[PDB]
Amino acid sequence: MDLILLMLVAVGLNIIDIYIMIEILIMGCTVNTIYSASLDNDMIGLIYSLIQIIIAGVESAIGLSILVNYNRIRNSEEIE
Amino acid sequence: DHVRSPNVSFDDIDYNNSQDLHNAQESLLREQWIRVSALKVCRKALESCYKTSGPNHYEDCREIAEKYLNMLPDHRIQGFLGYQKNDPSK
Amino acid sequence: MLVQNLIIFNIIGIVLLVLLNNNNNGILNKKSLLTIKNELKLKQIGLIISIINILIIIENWIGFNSNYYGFQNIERFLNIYWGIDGISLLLVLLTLILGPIAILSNWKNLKGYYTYYVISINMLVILMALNFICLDLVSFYILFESTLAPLFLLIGIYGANNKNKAAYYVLIYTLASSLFMLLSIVIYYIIINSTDYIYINNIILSINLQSLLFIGIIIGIAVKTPLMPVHTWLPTVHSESPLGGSILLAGVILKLAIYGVIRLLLPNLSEISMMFTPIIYIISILTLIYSSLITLKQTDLKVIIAYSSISHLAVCMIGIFANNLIGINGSLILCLAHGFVSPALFILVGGILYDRYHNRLINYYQGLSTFMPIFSIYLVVFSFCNTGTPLSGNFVGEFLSITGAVIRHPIIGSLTAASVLLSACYQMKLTNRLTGSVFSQYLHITNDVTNREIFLLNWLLIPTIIIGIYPSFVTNILNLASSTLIYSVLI
Amino acid sequence: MIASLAGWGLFGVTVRAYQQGIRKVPFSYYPLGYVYSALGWVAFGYGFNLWTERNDKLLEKRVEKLKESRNLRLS
Amino acid sequence: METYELIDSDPKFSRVVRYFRPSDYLTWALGTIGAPGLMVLFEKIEPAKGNTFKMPPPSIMRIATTIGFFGGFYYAYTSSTKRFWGYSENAKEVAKDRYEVKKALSEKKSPYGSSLLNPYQQDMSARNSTNSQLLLAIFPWFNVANHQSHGIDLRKYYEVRDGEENWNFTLPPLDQVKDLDVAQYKEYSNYP
Amino acid sequence: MLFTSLLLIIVYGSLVNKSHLLTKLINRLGLIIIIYTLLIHLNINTLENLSIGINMFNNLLLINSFNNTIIELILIICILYVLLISFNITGLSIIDNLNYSKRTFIVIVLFNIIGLTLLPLVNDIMILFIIIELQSYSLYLLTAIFNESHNSTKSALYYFIVGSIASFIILDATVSIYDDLGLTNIQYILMYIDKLEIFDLLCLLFGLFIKIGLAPFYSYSITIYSLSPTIITNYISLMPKLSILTLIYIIMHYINIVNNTDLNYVISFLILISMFIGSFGGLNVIRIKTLLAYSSLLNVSYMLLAILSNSNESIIAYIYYIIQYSLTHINIFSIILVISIYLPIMNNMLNVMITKYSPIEYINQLKNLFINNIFIAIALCISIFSLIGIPPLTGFYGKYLVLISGLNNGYVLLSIVLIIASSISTVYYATILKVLSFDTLSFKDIISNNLIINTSPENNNNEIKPEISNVISYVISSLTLIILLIIIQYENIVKGAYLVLLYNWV
Amino acid sequence: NSYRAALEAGNGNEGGFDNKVIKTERQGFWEGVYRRPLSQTVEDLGEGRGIITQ
Amino acid sequence: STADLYGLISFTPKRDIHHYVIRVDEVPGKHFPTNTTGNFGNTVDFENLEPRRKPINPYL
Ligand SMILES: CCCCCCCCCCCCCCCCCC(=O)OC[C@H](COP(=O)(O)OCCN)OC(=O)CCCCCCCCCCCCCCCCC
Ligand SMILES: CCCCCCCCCCCCCCCCCC(=O)OC[C@H](COP(=O)(O)OCCN)OC(=O)CCCCCCCCCCCCCCCCC
Ligand SMILES: CCCCCCCCCCCC(=O)OC[C@H](COP(=O)(O)OCC[N+](C)(C)C)OC(=O)CCCCCCCCCCC
Ligand SMILES: CCCCCCCCCCCC(=O)OC[C@H](COP(=O)(O)OCC[N+](C)(C)C)OC(=O)CCCCCCCCCCC
Ligand SMILES: CCCCCCCCCCCC(=O)OC[C@H](COP(=O)(O)OCC[N+](C)(C)C)OC(=O)CCCCCCCCCCC
C-alpha cells in the first residue's frame, strides 16, 4: 500500500510542509546508513552519515532563506 | 591513338587490388560493344541483301537473317556487375 | 581543380556582393550609386558570375575522355573526392546553364532585395552542380540537403499569397523524407566503414539488408521527385515560389532524384533493384496516369504546369529502372530535354502572363493570340515539345524510355505508352484555351513579349530541338557510363 | 606551414569583416581591427596545426597496437 | 609520447620551488604583471563606462596583481612539476636530484628527510598530495610532508652514470640509512 | 587557481563600495580568474598522459582523458558566458544595469565552476553526494540572485524543491549500494559489479535524470527556464547538462560491464518519451525561452541515445555533440540578448507586459530582424539551421554521429523515432525563421523611429557610431562562422575525438 | 542480432573481403561479400528477365 | 586506408564480468590509524607482494 502513493496524503498543503517531507526522506537515508555502518562494524559508513547530516543541514538553510525572501516579496510594498 | 582492351577475366584477379578490378570491369565492357558492332555489320548485310534480292530475299538472305535472329538475344550490353557479383560454377 | 575553382570563385563572388551592398547600411540614408536603377550594378555582377561558372566546367570538358571507364578529374578538396563521368558531365552542364536564366527571369519583377535574391540563386546553382560531382554517399547527402537553407528562405521572402504554406512544404517534405535516406547512408558507413562510391559498388549485402537499404533510399527519392502518393508538395510550391525558384526546382532539383537512382541504387543494391523494379513500375505508371488525369480538372495556371512536370518525371523513372541501355539512355536524355521545356513553360505561364495581369486563374485568359501573337507562337511550340513531338528532345527521351520499359517488362511496361496520349490532353487543352475564341473581356491589351522574355524562350527552345534532331551529342557521352549500371547474367 | 597559417589569417579577417555587418558600420571603419583579428586567429591557427600534427603522432602509435589486436581475432 | 626519467612521482613543495628554472620565474613574472595588463587591455577592447578609454581604479590594479601573483605561481609550479613526473625535459633536474640523493645517502641521512608523522600518516599524506597538481587549476594542494611513497627504487642512485665519478661519493647499504622503511623495523615489526 | 582567487574576490567584494562600475570591473577579474585556470589546467593536463586515468586525493577523484576534455569544455563556455556580464551586451543602461547590480553574481558563478568541473571526476559515493550538492546549491542561489524580481525568486523555490528531491534520490541509491557491499569507492565497487543490485545504479541515474530535465521530469525545467531572466537562463539550462551528462556517461560505462538488458529497456523508455514530448511540446508555444527549453530537452534526448549505446563510436559522437550544442546554445542566447534593442515602443492591445529581466520573451518580438540588422539575422538563422540539422553545419554531424552509434548497437527503433522527432521539431524552428524574414518585402517601405535603439542621443552625427558593443558582436561573429565553416576542419576535429579514451586502450 | 553483437561473434566484415572464397551457405544478415554463388541469385531474383535467360 | 583506420578505432572490444578495467593500483590496509594488526585476518604480506597489474598506455 505504498504503490498507491499513500505518502502524498500525509504531506501538508503548504510549501513549508514540502520542505519537512524532504528532510524526513533524507533522514531515512541516514538511519539506513547508520544501520549499515554499525552492523558491519564500519566507521567509513558512520563518516558518510556525519556528512549526510551536515550536508542536509545546509540544504535546509538555503530552502528557508529562499522561502523567507519569497514570502517577504508578497509583503514587500513598504509604503510607510 | 587506338588503345586496346586489356583482356582480364574476373576469375584471375583478387578484387582487393582496385587497379586490377577496374581492368576486369573495363575488359568485360569493351568486349560487349564489339559484339554489338558485329551485330550492326551482320544487320548491315541483311538490309543490302534484302533490297538487291527483291522477291528472292527469302532464299538469297536466308542464312544472314537466320544468323541475325540467333545472335540478337545475346548481342547487347549486359554489364559487368552480372558476372562480377555472381559465380556461375555454384 | 574544377571544384577548387568553382567553390572559391563563388565564395569570393558572394563576399564581393556582400561587401558592396552592406557597406552603405551605416547610419546614413541609402543615397548610393550601386542601388541606382534597382541595384543594376549589383544584379549585373550576379549575372556575370553565373555565366562564368559555365566557363569553369567547359575548361574541364575539353579534357574529358568519352571512352575511358570510371570517374575522371578525380580531385581531393575539403577531404572529399570529386569526380566526373559521362552522366555527371551533362547534368552539371545543364545545371549551370539554368543559372543565368534563373537570374535573368526575375530581372525586373522583384520589389526589392535583389542582392539577396542573386546570392540565393547562385548558391542553389553551385550546390546543385556540386551534387553531381561528389564521390561518397555522405557527401551526396550534404549537397542534397544544403539546398534547403536557401530554398526555404527564397520561397518565403519572394513568394505569393500562400508562401507560408509552401515554405513549410518544401522544407519539411524534403527533410522528413531525406532523413529516411540518412539512415541507409549510415548503415553503409557502419558495416563497410566507408561511403565511397567505388568502395561500396563492389560489396554485396544480404538479401534482407539490401531491402532495408533500398526502402530507406527510395523514400528519399520518391519524395524529391514527386511520385504518388507523396507528390502533394510540388504543386503547392510551384504555385507560390518565384520564377527563379520554379525554374531551378523543376529544372535541376527534381532531376537529382533520377541521378540519385544511378548512384545510390543500381550499382550497390543491384540485386534488390531487380526485385523492386516490378514495384516501381506499378507506382510509376499510376503516377503517370493519375497526374495526367488530375491535371485535366485543375484551375490554377502554374499548378497546371506543375502536374505536367510530374508526368514527365514518371517517364524518367520508368526508363531509368529498365535494365537495358535503351531505357537508361532515353531516361537521361529526357531529363536533359525536360530541363529546358519545363522551365520555359513557367516563363510563359508564371513569368509573362502573371507578370502583367497578376493572376493565375485559367478562367480569365482565352484568345491571347489576337493581341499577343508572339506569345502564342512560343506557347504552341513549347506545348508541342512538352507533349512528345518527334522533332523535340522530349520525344527522343519519351520514345527510348517507353521502348526501354517494354524490353524489361513487355506487359505492364506497355502502359507507359499512355504518356503519348495523356500528355496531349491536359497540355493542349491549356494551349487550346489560352489561344482560342475571342480575346477575353477581363484582360486589357498590354505590351507583347519584350526582348528579355523572348531571349529566354529562344535559348530554352534551341537546346530542346538540337537534342531532338541529333541526340548523338548526348548519347555518345552516356553510352559507356550507362552501360555499367546494367545487371544481367546470360548463360 | 605558412600555407596553413595564411588560411587562418584570412579567416580571422573575415570574422572582423562579418563583425562590422553585425555592428552596422562601413567595412573601412578602423582598419586595425582586421590586423588584430588576423593576428589573433593566426595565433589560434598556430596552436591548432600543432594540435593536429601532435594528434597524428599519437594516432598512428595507437593504430599499431590496434592492428596487432585485430590479428589475434583474425586467427 | 615524450617521456623522460621519473625523478619523483610526488615531488615535495620545497623541492618543486627549488628546481625553478630561470624561465619558470619569468613565467611567474609575466603572470604577476599580466593580470594588471589584461585588465588594462580589456578597457582598450571595450571601456567599462562611456565610449572612451579610462584606466581602471588604482584599487583594482592592486587586487589584480594579487590574483596574478597567486595565479602565475601555479603556472611555474606546474611547469616544474612536469619535470619531476617525467612529462617534461629533465636532464638538468636529473643531475641535480641524483647529486642531492647521493649526498643524502653518503652522509647516512635519508633522501626524503626526517618526519613528524608516524608511518601511517606518511602513507596517508602520500595519497592526499600525490598527483594533486592535475587539479591545481581547480584548487590548491601540495606535498609538504617528508614521506617515502615517491615511487622509486633507491638502488637507481647507487650505480654511477656518465659524468658522476668525479663527485667521489661513498654510499652505505640501505639497511643503515636513518629514516627508511628497510632500516626502521629492527625490534618490533609493528613499530618503527 | 579557482579556490585561491575566489576567496580573494569574496573578501575584496565587500571591502569596496557598491557601485556598478566597481562591480563590473570586479566581474572582469572573474574573467581573468577563469582564463588563468584554463591555462594552468591545459599546461599540466594532456590527453597522452591521462589515457590510463590518474587517481587523486586518496582515490576520491579519478581523472582520465574523457573527463579531462569536458573540464576544458566547461571552462571555455564559462569564459564566453562571463563576456556577457563583464562587457556590455546592448549598451543602453536601462537593460544592461541588471547585470551590474548584483556583486555576488560572479562569485556564485565561480562557486558553480568548481562544482561543475569536479563532478565528472567523482570516484567515491561519499564525494559524489557532496560534489553534486556544491553544484546543485550554486544553481539555486544563481536562480535567486535577483531577489527583487517575483518570477526569479519563485523559479529558485521551485528549482530548490525538485533539486532536493533529486538529491535525495541520488543519496538513497548510494546508501543502498553501500548497504549491499559495504564499500564506498567506485573502483572497489567495480570488483563487485556482478553481485550488487544493478538497478540501484539506475535509481542513481533517475536522480541525475531529474537534474538535467528528462521526461517525464521535463515539466519543471520548461517552467523554470521560461521564468528566470534571460541572463540567468543562459547559464542554468546549459551548464548543469555539461557536468551531468558526462557523469551519466561514466556510470553507463560501468553498467555496460554486465550489459543488463532490462536496464536498457527502461532507459530507452525514457529516451523514446523525451523525443515525443520534446518535439510535439514546442509546436504550440508563444514564448522564445519556452521554445528553446523544449529544444534543450530534445537535444538532451539525442545525446542520451549516444550515451545509452555506449560503444567506441559513442565517445566520438558524444564528445563532438556536447561541444557543438554548447557553442550553438551560447550563440543563440548571445543573439537574443542583443536583439532586444530593436523592440517597438507604444505611443493599447492585449496589455502585454514586458519586464526588464526578459525584454525578448515572445517569438513574435523578432519581427523584421532581416530589415533592422540583416547580418545578425543570418547568424540567428544559421544557428537555428544547425539545430534543425541542415548540412554541412555543425548540427548535421551531431545527428550523423549519434545515428552511427545508435544504429551500431541495435537501437533501430530509437533511431527511426529520433529522425521523426527531428522532422517534427523542424516545424517550430522554421517558425523562428518565418518570423524574421517572411515579411521583409511587405515591410521594406516602413516609417519607424520607435525602436529602443533610437533613444540614445546622437553624439556627433559625423563619426560612425556602431549600434552594438565590440566584444559581444565579435563573439557572435566568431561562433557563427564556426558553425557554418566546420566542413573545412571536420576531418581533423573528428580525429581529435578518436584520441579521447575512456578505458578503451586496446 | 545487432551489428555490434554480430561483429563480436565473427559475423561482421572486420577482416575485409575476398572473392576466391565463395560461400555455398547463405551469408549472414550483416555480412558482406565480394562475390556470390549464382544459385543464390536464381533463388532470390528468379530466372527470367536477364538472369540466366533473357 | 581511411576505411581501414576507421575499422580499427570503431571496434568495441567485448567487456563482461571476466575482463574489465579496474583502476586500483595497490592493496589497502598496509597501515591503519590504530591497531594495525587486528584479528590477524590481513593475510596479504606486503614484503612479498606479487607484481600488480600495470595499465597499458596505448600511446606509449
Ligand atoms: C496483502 C498484500 C499487500 C501487497 C501490497 C501491495 C498490493 C498490490 C498493489 C498493486 C500491485 C501492483 C504492482 C505489483 C508489484 C509490482 C510488479 C511486480 O513486481 O511483479 C509482480 C507482478 C507479477 O510478477 P511475476 O510475473 O510473478 O514475476 C515473477 C518472475 N519470476 O507484476 C504484475 O504483473 C502486476 C501487473 C502490473 C502491470 C499493469 C500495471 C502497470 C500499468 C499501470 C501503471 C500505473 C501508471 C505508472 C506509470 C509509470 C510512470 C512512468
Ligand atoms: C503517405 C505519406 C504520409 C506520411 C504521414 C502518414 C501518417 C500521418 C498520420 C496522420 C493520421 C492522423 C492525423 C489526422 C487524424 C485527425 C486527428 C485528430 O484531429 O484528432 C482526433 C482525436 C480527437 O478528435 P478531435 O480533437 O475532435 O479532432 C477532429 C478533427 N477532425 O484525437 C486523436 O485521436 C489523437 C490520437 C492520440 C495521439 C496519439 C499519438 C501517438 C503518436 C502518433 C504519431 C506521432 C509520432 C510518434 C513518434 C515521433 C515522436 C516520438
Ligand atoms: C557556395 C558556398 C557559400 C558559402 C558562403 C556563404 C555566405 C553567406 C552570406 C554571409 C553574409 C550575409 O549574411 O550577408 C547577407 C546577404 C546580403 O544581404 P543583402 O540583401 O545584400 O543586404 C542588404 C541590406 N540593405 C538592403 C539594408 C542594404 O544575404 C544573405 O544572407 C544571402 C546568402 C545567405 C542566405 C542563407 C544562409 C544560410 C546558409 C546555410 C548553409 C548553406
Ligand atoms: C562576409 C563574410 C561571410 C563569410 C565568407 C566566407 C569566408 C571564407 C573563409 C575561408 C577561410 C580559409 O580559407 O581558411 C583555410 C584555412 C587553412 O586550412 P589548413 O589549416 O591548411 O587546414 C586544411 C584544411 N583541409 C584539409 C580541408 C584542406 O583553414 C581555416 O582557417 C579553417 C577555418 C576554421 C574552421 C572552424 C573550426 C575551427 C575551430 C574549431 C571549433 C570546434
Ligand atoms: C598582437 C597579437 C594579439 C592580437 C590582439 C588580440 C586581442 C585584441 C586586442 C587589440 C586591441 C583592441 O581591441 O583594440 C580595439 C579594437 C577596435 O575597436 P572597435 O570595434 O573599432 O571599437 C571602436 C574603437 N575606436 C574608438 C578606437 C574606433 O578592437 C579590436 O581590435 C577588436 C578585435 C577583436 C579581438 C580579436 C582577437 C581574437 C582572438 C581569438 C582567439 C580565440
Numbering used by the authors:
A (entry chain K): 1 to 80
B (entry chain p): 3 to 92
C (entry chain M): 1 to 491
D (entry chain d): 1 to 75
E (entry chain O): 1 to 192
F (entry chain N): 1 to 347, 365 to 523
G (entry chain Y): 163 to 216
H (entry chain h): 123 to 182
How did the manuscript describe this experimental structure?
Mitochondrial NADH [reduced form of NAD+ (nicotinamide adenine dinucleotide)]:ubiquinone oxidoreductase [complex I (CI)] is a large multisubunit enzyme located in the inner mitochondrial membrane where, together with the other electron transport chain complexes, it maintains the proton-motive force and the NADH/NAD+ redox balance that are required for adenosine 5′-triphosphate generation and a host of metabolic processes (1–3). The process catalyzed by CI comprises a redox reaction coupled to proton translocation across the inner mitochondrial membrane. In the hydrophilic domain, two electrons are passed from NADH to ubiquinone [typically ubiquinone-10 (Q10)] via a flavin mononucleotide (FMN) and an extended chain of iron-sulfur (FeS) clusters, forming ubiquinol, which is reoxidized to sustain the electron transport chain and reduce O2 to H2O. Here, we report the structure of isolated CI from the yeast Pichia pastoris (Pp-CI) and identify distinct closed and open states that resemble those of mammalian CI.
During analysis, it quickly became apparent that the sample was compositionally heterogeneous, with some particles lacking the FMN-containing flavoprotein subcomplex (NDUFV1 and NDUFV2, responsible for NADH oxidation) and some particles exhibiting an unexpected density that formed a bridge between the two major arms of the L-shaped enzyme. In contrast, the presence/absence of the flavoprotein appeared not to cause any other changes, so it is likely unstable and simply prone to dissociation during purification, reconstitution, and/or grid freezing. When NUQM is bound, the enzyme adopts the canonical closed resting state that has been observed in many structures of CI from both prokaryotes and eukaryotes, whereas when NUQM is absent, the enzyme adopts a more “open” resting state with an increased apparent angle between the hydrophilic and membrane domains. The open state of Pp-CI observed here is an intermediate-level open state, with two elements in the membrane domain (TMH3ND6 in its π-bulge conformation and Tyr156ND1 flipped out of the E-channel) and the region of disorder observed in THM1–2ND3 (that facilitates NEM labeling) in open-type conformations but retaining the intact Tyr141ND1 trigonal junction (with Cys52ND3 and His107NDUFS2) and closed-like loops conformations around the Q10-binding site. Last, as also observed in twisted D. melanogaster and the Open1 state observed recently in mammalian CI, the Q10-binding site of open-state Pp-CI remains sealed to the matrix. Direct correlation of structural data with functional data showed that only the open state of isolated Pp-CI is sensitive to NEM treatment, consistent with a disordered section in the TMH1–2ND3 loop that carries C52ND3.
